[PDB]
Design a protein around this ligand. Structure first.
Ligand SMILES: [Mg+2]
Length: 381
């Protein structure tokens, strides 16, 4: 029974379709994701919580890993892992190794049927050949179906989408190494409307708190409420939300009236905390009214009464779906596009391919700025 890899985009569809899947059709399946935020966005459990993995988990640490509940996995026969590109090679082998301990040890993933959901950009054809998931030892042991389901479109408006797919296979050409330098500015208009892309959370938090500190409006300090058991390492936005008028922010939910999507940029025009309203102006002019938003933290549990897997809500987090959007790391911007992005090379290191993902996060390459030149062998993925 083959497993499945599919290439699906983080739309509202995916999230609710997965709920229908594992509630109305499948009763022996769960939905995992690599980080906490990624897990709450789609209503799943993080891989680490589902397996009670310590934070520094590694394949050799597995044989002697303590197991809280040997029984839950006996009832789990299909595992869906979303945002598969954010899973490390060694982590996927830990999952395989783990399943083999609790489930049938002679088969890959203990015999569990595995479904992987990734992005159009991250795709495949004793020591690891790369940190990316397709370099897991367990890919050797098994065969998969490949569905490029959401391949009928992409996340860029311009015609030279081709350039992204041209440096994919190291075929980045001299003829098209320029224009790629044409975007090398010297940043005369600092910075309005551009989000900086970085590699280190430290320096992204530094640029964010730079811009906020200079804005001369009063400082507002919005406090979200945590109920029950909610991991404070998976807050989509800080519990101490610091904001001012004029702040350049990002939206962290998908509007139901399709007025915005996770990643949309805006500017705060008013803050009214007694009424629990933040007003912001979008890029296309429209002013919106943002009220707080409740995220649910799930833990899968087997209901012995009904003989099906249930998503049991173990906590909640209520805060305004916003965070400072002057800067973000390449990792924390996984499902977002943006329109005005700054990729500084002078600061921030971008190993070729970390640099590619960066480029993969601007609607158009006209809304891009760089610092230094770009050669043909510095794009050798
Ligand atoms: Mg099933």
């Amino acid at each position: 029974s083959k497993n499945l890899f599919i290439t699906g985009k983080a739309g509202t569809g995916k999230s609710t379709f997965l709920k229908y899947l594992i509630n109305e059709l499948l009763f022996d399946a769960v939905v995992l994701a690599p980080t906490g935020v990624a897990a709450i966005n789609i209503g799943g459990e993080t891989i680490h919580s589902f397996f009670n993995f310590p934070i520094n988990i590694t394949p050799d640490k597995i044989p002697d890993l303590f197991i809280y509940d040997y029984e839950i996995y006996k009832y789990v026969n299909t595992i869906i892992i979303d945002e598969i590109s954010m899973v490390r090679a060694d982590l996927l082998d830990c999952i395989d190794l783990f399943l083999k301990r609790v489930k049938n040890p002679k088969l890959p993933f203990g015999g569990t049927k595995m479904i992987f959901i990734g992005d159009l950009y991250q795709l495949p054809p004793m020591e690891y050949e790369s940190p990316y998931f397709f370099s897991a030892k367990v890919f050797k042991e098994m065969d998969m179906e490949f569905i490029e389901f959401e391949t009928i479109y992409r996340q860029s408006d311009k015609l030279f989408i081709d350039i992204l797919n041209r440096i994919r296979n190291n075929t980045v050409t001299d003829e098209d190494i320029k224009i790629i330098n044409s975007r090398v500015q010297d940043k005369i208009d600092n910075d309005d409307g551009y989000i900086y892309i970085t590699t280190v959370n430290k320096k992204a938090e530094e640029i964010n708190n730079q811009k906020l500190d200079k804005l001369k409006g009063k400082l507002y300090k919005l406090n979200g409420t945590l109920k029950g058991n909610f991991d404070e390492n998976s807050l989509p936005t800080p519990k101490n939300l610091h904001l001012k008028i004029g702040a350049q922010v990002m939206l962290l939910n998908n509007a139901p009236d399709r007025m915005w999507v996770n990643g949309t940029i805006g500017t705060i025009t008013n803050i009214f905390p007694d009424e629990m309203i933040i007003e912001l102006a979008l890029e296309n002019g429209n002013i919106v009214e943002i009220t707080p938003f409740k995220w649910d933290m799930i833990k899968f549990t087997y209901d012995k009464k009904e003989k099906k897997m249930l998503s049991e809500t173990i906590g909640s987090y209520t805060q305004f779906p916003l965070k400072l959007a002057y800067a973000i790391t390449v990792h924390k911007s996984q499902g977002k596009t943006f329109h005005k992005v700054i990729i500084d090379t002078s600061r921030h290191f971008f190993a070729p391919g970390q640099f590619y993902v960066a480029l993969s996060r601007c609607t158009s390459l006209d809304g891009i700025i760089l610092t230094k030149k770009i050669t043909k062998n510095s794009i050798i993925l």
